[PDB]
PDB file of C-alpha atoms in Angstrom:
ATOM      1  CA  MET A 273      37.369  30.995 -31.288  1.00  0.00           C
ATOM      2  CA  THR A 274      36.443  33.025 -28.120  1.00  0.00           C
ATOM      3  CA  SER A 275      34.711  35.540 -30.368  1.00  0.00           C
ATOM      4  CA  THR A 276      32.881  32.704 -32.159  1.00  0.00           C
ATOM      5  CA  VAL A 277      31.625  31.299 -28.775  1.00  0.00           C
ATOM      6  CA  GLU A 278      30.570  34.870 -27.956  1.00  0.00           C
ATOM      7  CA  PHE A 279      28.870  35.133 -31.454  1.00  0.00           C
ATOM      8  CA  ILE A 280      26.913  31.882 -30.878  1.00  0.00           C
ATOM      9  CA  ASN A 281      26.132  33.167 -27.402  1.00  0.00           C
ATOM     10  CA  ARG A 282      24.738  36.422 -29.195  1.00  0.00           C
ATOM     11  CA  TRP A 283      22.304  34.300 -31.345  1.00  0.00           C
ATOM     12  CA  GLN A 284      21.590  32.199 -28.193  1.00  0.00           C
ATOM     13  CA  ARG A 285      20.710  35.443 -26.577  1.00  0.00           C
ATOM     14  CA  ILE A 286      18.007  36.297 -29.295  1.00  0.00           C
ATOM     15  CA  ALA A 287      16.827  32.722 -29.735  1.00  0.00           C
ATOM     16  CA  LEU A 288      16.236  32.101 -25.989  1.00  0.00           C
ATOM     17  CA  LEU A 289      14.665  35.556 -25.235  1.00  0.00           C
ATOM     18  CA  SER A 290      12.240  35.283 -28.215  1.00  0.00           C
ATOM     19  CA  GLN A 291      11.175  31.749 -27.283  1.00  0.00           C
ATOM     20  CA  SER A 292      10.597  33.036 -23.634  1.00  0.00           C
ATOM     21  CA  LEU A 293       8.557  36.033 -25.047  1.00  0.00           C
ATOM     22  CA  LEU A 294       6.529  33.689 -27.357  1.00  0.00           C
ATOM     23  CA  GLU A 295       5.401  31.373 -24.517  1.00  0.00           C
ATOM     24  CA  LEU A 296       4.703  34.249 -22.062  1.00  0.00           C
ATOM     25  CA  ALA A 297       2.712  36.229 -24.704  1.00  0.00           C
ATOM     26  CA  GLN A 298       0.444  33.006 -25.324  1.00  0.00           C
ATOM     27  CA  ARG A 299       0.102  32.728 -21.490  1.00  0.00           C
ATOM     28  CA  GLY A 300      -1.144  36.430 -21.295  1.00  0.00           C
ATOM     29  CA  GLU A 301       2.163  37.687 -19.490  1.00  0.00           C
ATOM     30  CA  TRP A 302       2.558  40.777 -21.813  1.00  0.00           C
ATOM     31  CA  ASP A 303       4.019  42.633 -18.723  1.00  0.00           C
ATOM     32  CA  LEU A 304       7.009  40.248 -18.821  1.00  0.00           C
ATOM     33  CA  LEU A 305       7.377  41.097 -22.695  1.00  0.00           C
ATOM     34  CA  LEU A 306       7.245  44.786 -21.767  1.00  0.00           C
ATOM     35  CA  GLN A 307      10.127  44.240 -19.021  1.00  0.00           C
ATOM     36  CA  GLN A 308      12.193  42.099 -21.333  1.00  0.00           C
ATOM     37  CA  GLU A 309      11.402  44.714 -24.201  1.00  0.00           C
ATOM     38  CA  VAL A 310      14.535  46.996 -23.617  1.00  0.00           C
ATOM     39  CA  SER A 311      16.660  43.939 -22.828  1.00  0.00           C
ATOM     40  CA  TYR A 312      15.609  42.256 -26.207  1.00  0.00           C
ATOM     41  CA  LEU A 313      15.985  45.367 -28.449  1.00  0.00           C
ATOM     42  CA  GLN A 314      19.520  45.902 -26.752  1.00  0.00           C
ATOM     43  CA  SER A 315      20.379  42.131 -27.405  1.00  0.00           C
ATOM     44  CA  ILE A 316      19.259  41.994 -30.989  1.00  0.00           C
ATOM     45  CA  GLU A 317      20.988  45.275 -32.131  1.00  0.00           C
ATOM     46  CA  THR A 318      24.164  44.414 -30.159  1.00  0.00           C
ATOM     47  CA  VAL A 319      24.290  41.198 -32.159  1.00  0.00           C
ATOM     48  CA  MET A 320      23.480  42.783 -35.563  1.00  0.00           C
ATOM     49  CA  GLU A 321      26.065  45.585 -35.229  1.00  0.00           C
ATOM     50  CA  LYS A 322      28.797  43.188 -33.959  1.00  0.00           C
ATOM     51  CA  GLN A 323      31.362  41.846 -36.528  1.00  0.00           C
ATOM     52  CA  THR A 324      31.346  38.176 -37.744  1.00  0.00           C
ATOM     53  CA  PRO A 325      34.348  36.119 -36.193  1.00  0.00           C
ATOM     54  CA  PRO A 326      36.908  34.158 -38.460  1.00  0.00           C
ATOM     55  CA  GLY A 327      36.874  30.733 -36.857  1.00  0.00           C
ATOM     56  CA  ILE A 328      33.455  29.319 -38.035  1.00  0.00           C
ATOM     57  CA  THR A 329      32.876  25.561 -38.838  1.00  0.00           C
ATOM     58  CA  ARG A 330      30.068  23.895 -40.809  1.00  0.00           C
ATOM     59  CA  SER A 331      28.614  22.969 -37.387  1.00  0.00           C
ATOM     60  CA  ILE A 332      28.701  26.617 -36.145  1.00  0.00           C
ATOM     61  CA  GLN A 333      27.092  27.776 -39.487  1.00  0.00           C
ATOM     62  CA  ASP A 334      24.165  25.432 -39.180  1.00  0.00           C
ATOM     63  CA  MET A 335      23.702  26.106 -35.348  1.00  0.00           C
ATOM     64  CA  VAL A 336      23.792  29.921 -35.768  1.00  0.00           C
ATOM     65  CA  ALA A 337      21.582  29.861 -38.785  1.00  0.00           C
ATOM     66  CA  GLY A 338      19.380  27.421 -36.890  1.00  0.00           C
ATOM     67  CA  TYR A 339      18.936  29.905 -34.160  1.00  0.00           C
ATOM     68  CA  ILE A 340      18.333  32.858 -36.632  1.00  0.00           C
ATOM     69  CA  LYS A 341      15.455  30.687 -38.189  1.00  0.00           C
ATOM     70  CA  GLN A 342      14.251  29.810 -34.735  1.00  0.00           C
ATOM     71  CA  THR A 343      14.070  33.316 -33.362  1.00  0.00           C
ATOM     72  CA  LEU A 344      12.678  34.730 -36.641  1.00  0.00           C
ATOM     73  CA  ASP A 345       9.787  32.396 -36.673  1.00  0.00           C
ATOM     74  CA  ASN A 346       9.101  32.548 -32.743  1.00  0.00           C
ATOM     75  CA  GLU A 347       9.193  36.288 -32.742  1.00  0.00           C
ATOM     76  CA  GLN A 348       7.204  36.363 -36.192  1.00  0.00           C
ATOM     77  CA  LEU A 349       4.276  34.576 -34.462  1.00  0.00           C
ATOM     78  CA  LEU A 350       4.729  37.450 -31.863  1.00  0.00           C
ATOM     79  CA  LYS A 351       4.796  40.210 -34.559  1.00  0.00           C
ATOM     80  CA  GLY A 352       1.703  38.783 -36.165  1.00  0.00           C
ATOM     81  CA  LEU A 353      -0.121  38.466 -32.885  1.00  0.00           C
ATOM     82  CA  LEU A 354       0.749  41.956 -31.611  1.00  0.00           C
ATOM     83  CA  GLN A 355      -0.172  44.173 -34.764  1.00  0.00           C
ATOM     84  CA  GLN A 356       0.987  41.999 -37.785  1.00  0.00           C
ATOM     85  CA  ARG A 357       4.050  44.484 -38.263  1.00  0.00           C
ATOM     86  CA  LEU A 358       7.591  43.042 -38.728  1.00  0.00           C
ATOM     87  CA  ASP A 359       8.902  45.447 -36.007  1.00  0.00           C
ATOM     88  CA  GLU A 360       7.182  45.816 -32.465  1.00  0.00           C
ATOM     89  CA  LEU A 361       7.516  46.374 -28.802  1.00  0.00           C
ATOM     90  CA  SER A 362       9.082  49.793 -28.825  1.00  0.00           C
ATOM     91  CA  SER A 363      11.529  50.434 -31.820  1.00  0.00           C
ATOM     92  CA  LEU A 364      14.873  49.613 -33.376  1.00  0.00           C
ATOM     93  CA  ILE A 365      15.432  52.271 -36.291  1.00  0.00           C
ATOM     94  CA  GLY A 366      11.761  53.072 -36.450  1.00  0.00           C
ATOM     95  CA  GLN A 367      11.086  50.689 -39.344  1.00  0.00           C
ATOM     96  CA  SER A 368      11.351  46.951 -40.034  1.00  0.00           C
ATOM     97  CA  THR A 369      15.066  46.491 -39.101  1.00  0.00           C
ATOM     98  CA  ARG A 370      14.761  42.842 -38.271  1.00  0.00           C
ATOM     99  CA  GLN A 371      13.408  41.333 -41.423  1.00  0.00           C
ATOM    100  CA  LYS A 372      15.749  43.156 -43.805  1.00  0.00           C
ATOM    101  CA  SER A 373      18.832  42.638 -41.414  1.00  0.00           C
ATOM    102  CA  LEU A 374      18.494  39.078 -40.053  1.00  0.00           C
ATOM    103  CA  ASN A 375      17.043  37.565 -43.268  1.00  0.00           C
ATOM    104  CA  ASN A 376      19.718  39.209 -45.480  1.00  0.00           C
ATOM    105  CA  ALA A 377      22.301  38.212 -42.693  1.00  0.00           C
ATOM    106  CA  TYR A 378      20.883  34.530 -42.908  1.00  0.00           C
ATOM    107  CA  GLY A 379      21.443  34.620 -46.728  1.00  0.00           C
ATOM    108  CA  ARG A 380      25.004  36.041 -46.380  1.00  0.00           C
ATOM    109  CA  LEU A 381      25.884  33.210 -43.801  1.00  0.00           C
ATOM    110  CA  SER A 382      24.257  30.695 -46.084  1.00  0.00           C
ATOM    111  CA  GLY A 383      26.056  32.010 -49.070  1.00  0.00           C
ATOM    112  CA  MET A 384      29.674  33.194 -48.224  1.00  0.00           C
ATOM    113  CA  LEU A 385      29.901  33.212 -44.264  1.00  0.00           C
ATOM    114  CA  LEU A 386      28.000  36.242 -43.106  1.00  0.00           C
ATOM    115  CA  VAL A 387      29.629  39.042 -45.243  1.00  0.00           C
ATOM    116  CA  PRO A 388      27.582  41.662 -47.359  1.00  0.00           C
ATOM    117  CA  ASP A 389      28.567  40.166 -50.735  1.00  0.00           C
ATOM    118  CA  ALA A 390      27.401  36.602 -51.551  1.00  0.00           C
ATOM    119  CA  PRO A 391      23.842  35.455 -50.645  1.00  0.00           C
ATOM    120  CA  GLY A 392      22.965  31.675 -51.053  1.00  0.00           C
ATOM    121  CA  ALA A 393      20.543  29.002 -50.199  1.00  0.00           C
ATOM    122  CA  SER A 394      20.223  25.111 -50.441  1.00  0.00           C
TER     123      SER A 394
END
């Protein structure tokens, strides 16, 4: 499950960075957001465009989805503070990539197991 550890480490990368950027933004350390900007955009797109691993458990599903939900809400408070727009900093695809991609991805993980077919929720 080395690819699954790497996958959880993908969503740890986004979760941890967005948490940092939340706290720092509230502290007025906007410079640190602008220095982490390209690092964060790099991270989030590397994660989205990287394939789902086979060896997932129920535990892994809830921790990954827990980190998706976490980074969505932290960075959403950021999005609202900055300009209210779902995409900010510099750009991903020029439009709200994050909302469409990570919320659909949440639904796919919750429905089948992160494949573009079955969306689900409890």
